[PDB]
């Protein structure tokens, strides 16, 4: 949920909620949102109907997830290289220098 | 009406990182893309995979 497009009509509560009118309106809405985008336009009748778009943001989610994984690593008792199974987290060392703690634990 | 695309690539990279962590294989093998870290000697990044294979 990053963008939401809200469609307003003047008279929309005067529907049987199960008749052909709702079916046609929902089919029209589905087709219009399927065929729209950049380079395509929508024709809106004035003084009876509007069209708005609401936005959001995703700022610091990956850092939050990395912090939670760091807590898991801290509680588990095993080196982050083993659990995350991803090097490059630190600068390129010789080799065993990062794994000495794990080797001591294994010993 | 305009919008924006701010942090999608980092989101996708984080999800791929979760896949790498769960799979049990080094990121070099799965992502098949070096340069992720600085230029090392060679086998230094692949020692974990070699230990797993042994």
């Amino acid at each position: 949920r990053k963008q939401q497009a809200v469609w307003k009509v003047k008279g929309l509560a005067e529907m049987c909620d199960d008749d052909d009118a709702q079916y046609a309106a929902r089919l029209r809405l589905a087709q219009v949102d399927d065929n729209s985008g950049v380079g395509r336009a929508i024709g809106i009748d004035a003084e009876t109907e509007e069209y708005d778009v609401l936005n959001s943001d995703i700022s610091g989610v990956p850092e939050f997830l990395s912090s939670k994984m760091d807590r898991i690593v801290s509680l588990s008792g095993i080196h982050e290289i083993i659990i995350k199974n991803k090097n490059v987290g630190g600068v390129s060392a010789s080799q065993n220098t990062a794994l000495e703690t794990f080797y001591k634990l294994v010993d | 009406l305009n919008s924006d695309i701010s942090g999608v690539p980092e989101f996708l990279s984080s999800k791929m990182d979760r896949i790498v962590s769960l799979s049990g294989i080094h990121e070099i093998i799965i992502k098949n893309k070096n340069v992720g870290g600085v230029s090392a000697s060679q086998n230094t990044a692949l020692e974990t995979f070699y230990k797993l294979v042994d």
Partner: peptide, 23 residues
């Protein structure tokens, strides 16, 4: 029951089995 958690989660399985195999 820890059996279901061990079976379903890969992280718990790795945590349990990483040490004995290395030894």
């Amino acid at each position: 029951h820890v059996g279901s958690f061990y079976n379903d989660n890969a992280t718990a399985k790795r945590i349990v089995d990483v040490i004995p195999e290395e030894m």
